[PDB]
């Protein structure tokens, strides 16, 4: 029977945490009841609960005060849906987080960290995938991911926004035909916009350029 050593921390630490949850919900319900309106203060406070190991969303449960903060996070989740339907023609099913942040939401006081969460909520409806490009996140509203080919193209469209048949041949070291064959695939599918005025070749543009500046 080994009592002394182990439980000296268990008992003690257990109460430290549990009783702290109360202290936590207090600062939130009392002071940061203006939290409902500050995209920064959220990301601060939420990065603590994460560190302890608490679903911050759960702290909000019991209070009237804190049940707006959820109601915001849902409000958003409900907008993200909507965004993705309106753009589905513009971008062909996929939108940069960039777009979401700066374009559609800057209008309603919502921040990248907030969004990110919303989207992790909608993992619940088994709906959109995420995918990164040259490291930047995107959001896939449509029902099938992009071939290895397709992704690279976008990687190339990161710098200029477009991609020639020649341009492919030159940077990634692609073929002539392999490129255009798999490059016209892309416009059937509404992802890329064509631009013929560009010269000898046509260039294939990525609706995302627009957004980032």
């Amino acid at each position: 029977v080994n009592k002394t050593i182990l439980e000296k921390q268990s008992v003690e630490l257990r109460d430290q945490l549990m009783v702290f949850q109360e202290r936590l919900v207090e600062f939130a319900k009392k002071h940061n009841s203006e939290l409902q309106a500050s995209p920064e203060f959220r990301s601060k406070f939420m990065h603590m609960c994460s560190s302890i190991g608490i679903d911050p969303l759960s702290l909000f449960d019991r209070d009237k005060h804190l049940f707006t903060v959820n109601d915001f996070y849902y409000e958003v989740c409900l907008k993200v849906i909507e965004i993705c339907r309106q753009t589905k023609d513009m971008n062909g099913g996929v939108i940069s987080f960039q777009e979401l942040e700066k374009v559609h939401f800057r209008k309603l006081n919502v921040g990248l960290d907030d969004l990110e969460k919303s989207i992790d909520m909608l993992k619940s409806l088994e709906c959109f995938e995420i995918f990164q490009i040259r490291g930047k996140k995107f959001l896939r509203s449509v029902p099938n991911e992009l071939t290895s080919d397709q992704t690279k193209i976008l990687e190339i469209c990161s710098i200029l926004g477009y991609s020639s048949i020649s341009l492919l041949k030159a940077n990634l070291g692609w073929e002539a035909v392999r490129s255009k064959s798999a490059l016209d695939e892309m416009v059937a599918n509404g992802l890329l916009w064509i631009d013929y005025q560009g010269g000898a070749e046509a260039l294939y543009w990525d609706p995302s350029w627009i957004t980032r500046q």
């Binding site: 849902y74 909520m121 449509v142 029902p143």
Partner: protein, 171 residues
């Protein structure tokens, strides 16, 4: 009516479910036929259910939308079921998938060569009450394409669908 008055999490959902089941059933059944259906991608459902019923009544976490619908079968709401059909399709329907698949297919077998923009209009009009929301359209389409149930014709102009009539793939 019902926001944060409910203490028991479970009972809440139990009643949220009842609400949706009734919402959706409301959004279609003409009761002049039992040839009428509803497929909805869950996401599209949550879009409207909330927007229409619960605005001001209390809003819903998708996590709770999913959990709600998952238990119709348990509360004896039998007309509508929630199911995952392949890897990807997660939706609520009044009928078997296969049965609704076949339906769409054969409509193309009447309206061949047609593409989404037209297939939207033709199949689901505004006041012509066949209840194909957009989301589920593309999702089904893409499905029958994989299992070989539907044939295609890609051009820049867009994608164009036809019915599989020269080729195999038994039910």
């Amino acid at each position: 009516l019902d926001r944060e008055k409910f203490l028991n999490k479970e009972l809440f959902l139990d009643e949220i479910a009842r609400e949706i089941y009734e919402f959706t059933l409301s959004e279609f059944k003409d009761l002049n036929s039992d040839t009428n259906y509803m497929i909805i991608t869950l996401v599209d459902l949550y879009a409207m259910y909330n927007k229409s019923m619960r605005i001001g009544t209390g809003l819903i976490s998708p996590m709770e939308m999913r959990e709600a619908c998952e238990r119709f079968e348990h509360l004896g709401l039998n007309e509508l079921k929630l199911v995952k059909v392949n890897k990807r399709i997660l939706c609520v329907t009044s009928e078997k998938f296969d049965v609704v698949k076949e339906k769409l297919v054969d409509l193309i077998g009447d309206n061949p060569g047609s593409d989404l923009l037209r297939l939207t209009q033709i199949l689901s009009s505004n006041n012509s009450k066949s209840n194909w929301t957009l989301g589920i359209l593309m999702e089904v389409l893409q499905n029958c394409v994989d299992e070989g149930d539907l044939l295609i014709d890609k051009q820049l102009s867009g994608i164009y669908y036809y019915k599989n009539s020269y080729w195999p793939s038994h039910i």
